[PDB]
Give the backbone structure.
Amino acid sequence: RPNHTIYINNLNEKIKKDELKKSLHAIFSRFGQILDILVSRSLKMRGQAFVIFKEVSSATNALRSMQGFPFYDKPMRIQYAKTDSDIIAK
RNA sequence: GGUCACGCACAGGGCAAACCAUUCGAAAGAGUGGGACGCAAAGCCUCCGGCCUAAACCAUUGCACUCCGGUAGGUAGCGGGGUUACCGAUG
Ligand SMILES: Nc1nc2c(ncn2[C@@H]2O[C@@H]3COP(=O)(O)O[C@H]4[C@@H](O)[C@H](n5cnc6c(=O)[nH]c(N)nc65)O[C@@H]4COP(=O)(O)O[C@H]3[C@H]2O)c(=O)[nH]1
Ligand code: IRI
Ligand code: IRI
Ligand code: IRI
Ligand code: IRI
Ligand code: IRI
Ligand code: IRI
Ligand code: IRI
Ligand code: IRI
Ligand code: IRI
Ligand SMILES: [Mg+2]
Ligand SMILES: [Mg+2]
């Protein structure tokens, strides 16, 4: 399970890629280095975001630390990415 | 001449990108004035394919790294298609 990337969803869809990123990057950059933050608003990539960390140990903290954390009046469903990210993969 | 194409010009003209000002819009963007990058339809029309925005509404709890919900708007200076038109070495 543990992975460089954490998988978030139940994300307020009203938020925009730009700001969603900034804010996610704000909150989560507290736990380590973010190689990147992937947010798309397409039909089925929406309400979710991937947060890729430098250290796999950063992700675990994130997960553990901020589960269900209230974010834009919603709670965060956090969990690991079944797979890695092309950065971490390649 | 008229027609259907064509654009090496001829000749008389037309439009106006970026950017600025100001107005409208949530945004894309559009209006108007200034201003020209270009344009032989850069006149006009969303039927077809792209791309852009996506406040509201409706659906979607959804695992991606090409990108893509419905609806709505935009782009005709992205194409194609329709349609109107000036000049005639041209065919
Ligand atoms: N009247 C007429 N003349 C034609 C036509 N096709 C070609 N020509 C002549 O041939 C020249 C070359 O045209 P171009 O390569 O398409 O290049 C043209 C074109 O791209 C542009 N342009 C000029 N007027 C117009 C216009 O009314 N509409 C559009 N869309 N573009 C224009 O400027 C360029 C040079 O302009 P010109 O000094 O007139 O120079 C033009 C013009 O003299 C046509 O359908 N009608
Ligand atoms: N000269 Ir004239 N103006 N440029 N006619 N060719 N279009
Ligand atoms: N004024 Ir206004 N143009 N800037 N409407 N807010 N968008
Ligand atoms: N003539 Ir025209 N080249 N400008 N429209 N086809 N794109
Ligand atoms: N055809 Ir349309 N849908 N109208 N692509 N141009 N946007
Ligand atoms: N193409 Ir419409 N017409 N469908 N613009 N997107 N709304
Ligand atoms: N006219 Ir038209 N050239 N712009 N639509 N065909 N693409
Ligand atoms: N100006 Ir315009 N570049 N934005 N042509 N409309 N596409
Ligand atoms: N005019 Ir027309 N540009 N040639 N639209 N038909 N494609
Ligand atoms: N009319 Ir005649 N056909 N003869 N256009 N000038 N070439
Ligand atoms: Mg030519
Ligand atoms: Mg023009």
Observations:
- Residues 5, 7, 9-10, 13-14, 36, 38, 40-50, 77, 81-83, 85-87, 89 of chain A lie near RNA strand B (CB under 10 Å from a C1').
- The two ends of chain A are 19 Å apart (CA to CA).
- The helical segments of chain A are 17-28, 56-66, 86-89.
- Chain A has one domain: 1-90.
